[PDB]
């Protein structure tokens, strides 16, 4: 039943939230809205409360509000950000106009760790183990992240990690010397083909490299510069991959480059644990069909210390038949409402 809400101006707008949430402090905007840290007095947790920015302004907005909610409602894994609460001050569909999402707030992201302390090989094991464990889960529900990078990894005081912003940039946001593109699989970066979940394993290799060396693995100054950084390391594509690049235009550009062999990763990653080098070669394969999967990677010797086949769970089935559905604003909105109304908090 309905808790009492209180109002306050934050981030230049009125936030109206249940009493349980106290000490709301703006912490900068996230995916499609402003975020505040809060103390949840009912659970004792430090939480992130996101107020969605104009969630039903357009069809595109309405459907992405519905999508984010559906996604967050489905995720129930230690290494994936789940939904602690969702609420609206509206008392009926007629007055439904705002959506607030509540999740765990961790001390920092991986960006802050990568810059602010030295990572032992053990820290790299633990962190990558945790990303692959959440990724096996995500992938098992047939969801793709597409945008895995250190700023989408929430890490706490004890190096416990949660993945954020799965299954959700403008051409301008992908332009130039920008982290928003440094972790992207080449096939998605230059639209070579119909892409799948394997793109995610590529980003994991980029992240792992960077934890090991302290440096961005492919800090391209633009798409072409980055492509060259990638090809230098992994080699130009062979005949078999060229056929799978179904963009004739892109296939043709690729073919204009002088062929290069795959470099020796032991000389690229000097000092690195040999098991880590091996895993990097298995993740950083240009042919996406041949990259190691998350499930397979968890069973790689590098994670012997953490691997436990009985505690690496799969997801319940995720119905995203809505993705290919054409609905009006008021219909995505009604659907969203039903999802808010029927939310049951975690146990």
Ligand X SMILES: Cc1ccccc1C(=O)c1c[nH]c(C(=O)NCc2ccco2)c1
- The one catalytic residue among 40, 147, 165, 200: 165
The residue (of 47 and 315) whose beta carbon lies closer to ligand X is: 47
128 touches ligand X by CB under 6 A: no
Binder among 17, 35, 335, 340 for ligand X (CB under 6 A): 35
Does 276 carry a binding-site annotation? no
Q: Mask 194-233, x = binds ligand X (CB under 6 A)?
A: ----------------------------------------
Binder among 50, 70, 136, 300 for ligand X (CB under 6 A): 50
Diameter over CA atoms, the chain: 67
48 touches ligand X by CB under 6 A: yes
Does 107 carry a binding-site annotation? no
Please tell me whether residue 175 adopts helix, strand or coil conformation.
coil
Does 205 carry a binding-site annotation? no
Binder among 34, 65, 88, 103 for ligand X (CB under 6 A): 103
- The conformational region for residue 146 under phi > 0 = left, psi -120 to 50 = alpha, else beta, is left
The residue (of 161 and 231) whose beta carbon lies closer to ligand X is: 161
Contact 315, 138 (CB under 8 A): yes
Does 29 carry a binding-site annotation? yes
Contact 189, 227 (CB under 8 A): yes
30 touches ligand X by CB under 6 A: yes
Beta partners for residue 16, in sequence order: 7
CA distance 197 to 234: 20
105 touches ligand X by CB under 6 A: yes
164 touches ligand X by CB under 6 A: yes
Q: How far is the CB of 87 from ligand X (least distance, A)?
A: 12
The residue (of 45 and 90) whose beta carbon lies closer to ligand X is: 45
Location of structure tokens 């969801």: 143
154 touches ligand X by CB under 6 A: yes
79 touches ligand X by CB under 6 A: no
280 touches ligand X by CB under 6 A: no
75 touches ligand X by CB under 6 A: no
In 3D space, the residue among 138, 170, 164, 168 whose CA is nearest the CA of residue 67 turns out to be 168
Angle at which helix 198-213 crosses helix 121-140, to 10 degrees, equals: 170
**What is the DSSP secondary structure assignment for residue 8, as one 8-state letter?**
E
Does 334 carry a binding-site annotation? no
CA distance 344 to 270: 50
Could you give the count of Cα atoms lying within 13 Å of 148 in the half-sphere of its Cβ? Answer: 27
Contact 212, 119 (CB under 8 A): yes
Task: Work out the number of other CB atoms within 10 angstroms of the CB of residue 91.
Answer: 9
**What is the DSSP secondary structure assignment for residue 295, as one 8-state letter?**
H
Binder among 52, 75, 106, 280 for ligand X (CB under 6 A): 106
The distance from CA 228 to its chain's CA centroid, rounded to whole angstroms, is 25
Does 34 carry a binding-site annotation? yes
81 touches ligand X by CB under 6 A: yes
Does 31 carry a binding-site annotation? yes
The residue (of 106 and 335) whose beta carbon lies closer to ligand X is: 106
The residue (of 165 and 187) whose beta carbon lies closer to ligand X is: 165
The residue nearest ligand X at its CB is: 30
Token digits of residue 280: 């990097």
Contacts with 266 (C-beta within 8 Å, 6 or more apart), sequence order: 272, 274, 277
165 assigned to active site: yes
Binding residues for ATP: 27-35, 50
Catalytic residue numbers read: 165
Sites of contact with ligand X (CB under 6 A): 30, 35, 48, 50, 81, 101, 103-106, 108-109, 154, 164-165
């Amino acid at each position: 039943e309905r808790p009492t809400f209180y109002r306050q101006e934050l981030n230049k707008t009125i936030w109206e939230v249940p009493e349980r949430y106290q000490n709301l402090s703006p912490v900068g905007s996230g995916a499609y809205g402003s975020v505040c840290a809060a103390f949840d007095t009912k659970t004792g947790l430090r939480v992130a409360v996101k107020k969605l920015s104009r969630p039903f302004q357009s069809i595109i907005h309405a459907k992405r509000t519905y999508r984010e909610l559906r996604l967050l409602k489905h995720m129930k894994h230690e290494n994936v950000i789940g939904l602690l609460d969702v609420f609206t001050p509206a008392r009926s569909l007629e007055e439904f106009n705002d959506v607030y999402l509540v999740t765990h707030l961790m001390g920092a992201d991986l960006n802050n760790i990568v810059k602010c302390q030295k990572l032992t090989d053990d820290h790299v094991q633990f962190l990558i183990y945790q990303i692959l464990r959440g990724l096996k889960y995500i992938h098992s529900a047939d969801i793709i992240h597409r945008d895995l990078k250190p700023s989408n990894l929430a890490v706490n005081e004890d190096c416990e990690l949660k993945i954020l912003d799965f299954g959700l940039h403008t051409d301008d946001e992908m332009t130039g010397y920008v982290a928003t593109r440094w972790y992207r699989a080449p096939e998605i970066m230059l639209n070579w083909m119909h892409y799948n979940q394997t793109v995610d394993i590529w980003s994991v290799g980029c992240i792992m490299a960077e934890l090991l060396t302290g440096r961005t693995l492919f800090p391209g100054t633009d798409h072409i510069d980055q492509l060259k950084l990638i090809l230098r390391l992994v080699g130009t594509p062979g005949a078999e991959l060229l056929k799978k690049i179904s963009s004739e235009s892109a296939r043709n550009y690729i073919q204009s480059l002088t062929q290069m062999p795959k470099m020796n990763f032991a000389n690229v990653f000097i000092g690195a644990n040999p098991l880590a080098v091996d895993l990097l070669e298995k993740m950083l394969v240009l042919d996406s069909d041949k990259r190691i999967t998350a499930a397979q990677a968890l069973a790689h010797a590098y994670f012997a210390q953490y691997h436990d086949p009985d505690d690496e769970p799969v997801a319940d089935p995720y119905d995203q038949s809505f993705e290919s559905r054409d609905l009006l604003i008021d219909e995505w909105k009604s659907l969203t409402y039903d999802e808010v109304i029927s939310f049951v908090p975690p146990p």
